Design a protein around this ligand. Structure first.
Ligand SMILES: [Ca+2]
Length: 158
């Protein structure tokens, strides 16, 4: 039913509408397109910078999930823009996206994955906790981690 591919530029507008519909319509987050410039240039911000951006796609090749990673200093990384279509959330698509990131991090000598998220993503918190992430304090984040978010997590790979 589902395949994981690297983001390509054809998906720019679809990706942005996907993320924004979930953020604004489903979670009622006060955020919009111009708050998220990284999405305007994914190749530049994620792929060309030593990061990752993967799409979970269905049989029609439409986006049903997303996951990004930025590379930090000191061989660490930050998870970004993880989203899964509501109609596909108990098909283990989040797990498959994460697994792809973890495997790619191992190839690229990344020791760990930090993330920040909002309390409004209730299910995502339990997901991270159930998938190797421990909750950390804001003062525990490294200096190259970009601070935005009210809940922080870390998963050790090494
Ligand atoms: Ca705005």
């Amino acid at each position: 039913a589902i395949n994981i591919i690297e983001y390509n530029r054809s998906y720019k507008e679809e990706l942005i509408e996907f993320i924004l519909s979930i953020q604004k319509n489903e979670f009622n987050i006060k955020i919009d397109r111009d708050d998220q410039p990284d999405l305007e240039n994914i190749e530049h911000n994620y792929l060309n910078s030593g990061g990752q951006f993967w799409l979970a796609i269905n049989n029609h090749q439409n986006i049903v999930g997303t996951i990004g990673l930025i590379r930090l200093d000191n061989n660490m990384s930050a998870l970004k823009k993880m989203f899964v279509d509501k109609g596909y959330r108990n098909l283990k698509i989040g797990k498959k996206l994460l697994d792809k990131v973890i495997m790619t991090c191992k190839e690229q000598n990344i020791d760990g994955i930090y993330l920040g998220t909002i309390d409004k993503f209730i299910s995502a918190q339990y997901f991270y906790s159930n998938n190797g992430f421990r909750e950390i304090k804001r003062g525990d984040l490294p200096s190259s981690f970009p601070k935005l978010d009210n809940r922080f997590y870390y998963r050790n790979l090494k």
